[PDB]
Design a binder for this molecule. Structure first.
Ligand SMILES: O=c1cc[nH]c(=O)[nH]1
Lengths: 250, 244
């Protein structure tokens, strides 16, 4: 049948029960082309949807847009169409000293600084990935030859104050988030991003398997600026890792 | 040059007012309603046009879905000198008396989002600037449409936070069980997904903002839709005129 936002049907998916879900529509086709017989399905707003084949099995690639709210729509609609496993892939900025540009982060849990996660489970509930998925992700990341870090990611509804940035129009951060950056750093949190709490919470409380893997393209604590080569490799590595992780899941 | 929108202060040609629809696909149509529309940039869900309205530079910029993507657009536009933000959209009503085709101008939003808490504590009201609300009401009335001023419920999800049960799991978390009836009985007009974030971040940061929406469906009960779509963008451009 046709879902309201993604504009595809269950038949369109060709029995796919796994989706790779990047944030940016413009990464979708690039991820699908690492696989076999990529076919464009639809593009509405931030949702660009392709199907492809991995080891003879149908797999969907669907962008989610920025933030938990746009993500919750994509996940819910893919679930209605029979998708049961969701592999988030991305790039990110680290906030710990020992984490280098080019390294991979597999999320073991997210700090829920979002709003959408609360629409699925109360705050007490752990925003945790599915164990098989994190396990498949770790393995695929290790095999890429990159250094892999397992740990907690802080997941914010904003890019600016929720990540305690002061280089902004007002130069001000609301009380709740003042000092929060140092707080996460001291608690061992690895990186910030903006969709994982919502994805992990909704899936963990709804019988869907999910997980997040991200290549580090910047370390926010270091002045040294990464060269373009290292960045291109990292983006390339990120998406090969998630496809290889998808392979392990099948 | 701002990080997500990819435009500079110079690109805006002095604009201090932006019209901010959700969908990138609507940005060009809105800009062409005015004079000398010019493409500025497109990156992810952010398509940015500039235009001129009664001799003044105006920006049109999509925000994508949800409070988080909106928060980025608004902040970067503000860094570029933008002080007034006119949100236009279409929406689904939850009051039986509100008709497909009517306009709703939000007078406050129930904060069922998350991003608003990144700007002000929950006690802070998600309320439009009074001049913008006034411009919006006047412009809506001039369109011949029936206009409702009222409270909007602004949710971070489309499904459980708007108490939809027609879903994969068929469950709605305890916080939102019975919430639709609750909002109805308190006279809330409609649901949408960005207004709480937009209104809180602007009201708490010295920016003027408001929301107007055409009603395209009713939760309680074509292409009348296309007529409403078109009317809604005519309404927001006229409201812009009144603000300038
Ligand atoms: O019910 C609706 C209809 C349109 N948009 C929403 O956010 N909710």
């Amino acid at each position: 049948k046709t879902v309201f936002h993604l504009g595809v049907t269950e038949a369109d998916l060709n029995g796919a029960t796994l989706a790779i879900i990047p944030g940016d529509p413009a990464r979708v086709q690039k991820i699908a082309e690492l696989m076999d017989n990529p076919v464009f399905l639809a593009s509405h707003r931030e949702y660009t949807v392709y199907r492809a084949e991995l080891d003879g099995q149908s797999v969907v690639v669907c962008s989610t847009g920025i933030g938990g709210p746009s993500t919750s729509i994509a996940v819910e609609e893919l679930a209605q169409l029979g998708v049961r496993t969701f592999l988030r892939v991305g790039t990110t900025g680290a906030i710990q000293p020992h984490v280098n540009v080019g390294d991979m982060i597999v999320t073991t849990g997210s700090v829920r600084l979002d709003g959408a996660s609360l629409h699925f489970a109360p705050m007490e509930f752990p925003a945790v990935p599915d164990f098989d998925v994190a396990t498949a992700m770790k393995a695929a990341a290790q095999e890429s030859g990159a250094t892999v870090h397992m740990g907690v990611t802080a997941s914010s509804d904003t890019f600016y104050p929720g990540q305690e940035r002061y280089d902004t129009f007002t130069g001000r951060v609301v009380r709740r988030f003042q000092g929060s950056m140092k707080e996460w750093q001291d608690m061992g949190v690895l990186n910030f991003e903006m969709e994982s709490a919502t994805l992990l919470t909704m899936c963990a409380s709804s019988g869907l398997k999910a997980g997040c893997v991200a290549g580090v393209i910047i370390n926010r604590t270091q002045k040294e600026i990464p060269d373009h080569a290292t960045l291109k490799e990292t983006e390339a590595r990120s998406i090969k890792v998630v496809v290889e992780a998808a392979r392990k899941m099948l």
